[PDB]
Amino acid sequence: SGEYPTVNEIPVGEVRLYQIADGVWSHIATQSFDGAVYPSNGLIVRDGDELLLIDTAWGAKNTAALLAEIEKQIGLPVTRAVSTHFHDDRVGGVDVLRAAGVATYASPSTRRLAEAEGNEIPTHSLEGLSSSGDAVRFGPVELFYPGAAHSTDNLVVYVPSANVLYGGCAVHELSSTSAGNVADADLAEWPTSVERIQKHYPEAEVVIPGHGLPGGLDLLQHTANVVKAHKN
Numbered sequence: 177s178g179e180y181p182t183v184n185e186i187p188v189g190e191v192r193l194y195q196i197a198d199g200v201w202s203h204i205a206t207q208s209f210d211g212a213v214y215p216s217n218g219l220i221v222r223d224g225d226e227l228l229l230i231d232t233a234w235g236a237k238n239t240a241a242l243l244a245e246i247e248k249q250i251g252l253p254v255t256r257a258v259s260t261h262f263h264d265d266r267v268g269g270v271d272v273l274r275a276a277g278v279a280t281y282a283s284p285s286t287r288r289l290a291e292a293e294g295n296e297i298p299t300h301s302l303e304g305l306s307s308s309g310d311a312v313r314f315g316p317v318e319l320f321y322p323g324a325a326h327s328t329d330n331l332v333v334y335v336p337s338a339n340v341l342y343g344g345c346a347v348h349e350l351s352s353t354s355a356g357n358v359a360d361a362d363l364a365e366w367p368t369s370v371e372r373i374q375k376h377y378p379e380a381e382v383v384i385p386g387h388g389l390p391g392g393l394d395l396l397q398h399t400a401n402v403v404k405a406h407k408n
């Protein structure tokens with residue numbers, strides 16, 4: 177009822193949306209992995225009379241539920257989606273999106289990693305993002321490659337109209353003490369990549385992590401701290 181959704185408020189198999197700013201929502205869904213249940217976020221950005229989706233809802237049925245929730249709550253068509261790295265919480269559901277007519281996009285690095293992992297593969301390659309510090313425009317957002325962090329391919333997304341920074345899985349929520357699933361991370365480079373984010377987007381007003389609650393700029397330094405505590 178207005179608080180940021182968690183697993184305890186999302187009915188089984190459903191998705192919730194949360195209004196972040198004018199024309200900006202996050203989407204929240206729950207999934208089980210290796211016997212534990214996790215929340216995950218994505219983003220929705222209004223693009224005139226269409227919508228841009230960032231990240232799937234972590235699985236085929238969750239992503240179908242996401243599309244239905246969007247139609248119920250917003251009622252504008254999702255025409256494009258970007259996945260911000262190759263893990264299932266970002267691409268699992270891309271087949272559902274594609275079959276619904278959504279054009280799906282990711283960097284070439286994410287596409288290669290997804291294919292090699294056996295994960296669903298976005299259709300279209302996003303060039304211009306292969307070097308740390310690169311940025312490109314995509315509809316109403318900027319896509320930025322900060323360098324290796326949670327994964328070597330992770331992208332962040334900035335919504336300039338609202339000063340919303342969607343960090344994806346390179347950014348952790350404030351309540352975290354641990355650094356999440358680091359199987360594919362570069363813990364040594366992650367703080368440098370976070371520093372690049374901080375330098376590029378110093379006016380961000382909302383920071384959204386890939387899992388957990390949004391907050392402010394503090395999420396960036398906090399993420400560096402938790403990653404360093406893990407590495408130690």
Ligand SMILES: CC(C)c1cccc2c(-c3ccc(C[S@@](C)(N)O)c(F)c3)c(C(=O)O)[nH]c12
Nearest residue numbers: 209263264265345352353354355356357386387
């Ligand atoms: C490879 C993908 C599909 C995957 C599977 C299972 C879990 C994760 C996580 C993850 C794990 C723990 C926390 C809470 S803590 C931060 N306190 O450690 C968490 F927030 C996330 C992440 C992630 O970190 O993105 N990915 C996961």
Ligand SMILES: [Zn+2]
Nearest residue numbers: 261263326345
């Ligand atoms: Zn991941």
Ligand SMILES: [Zn+2]
Nearest residue numbers: 265345386387
């Ligand atoms: Zn993640």
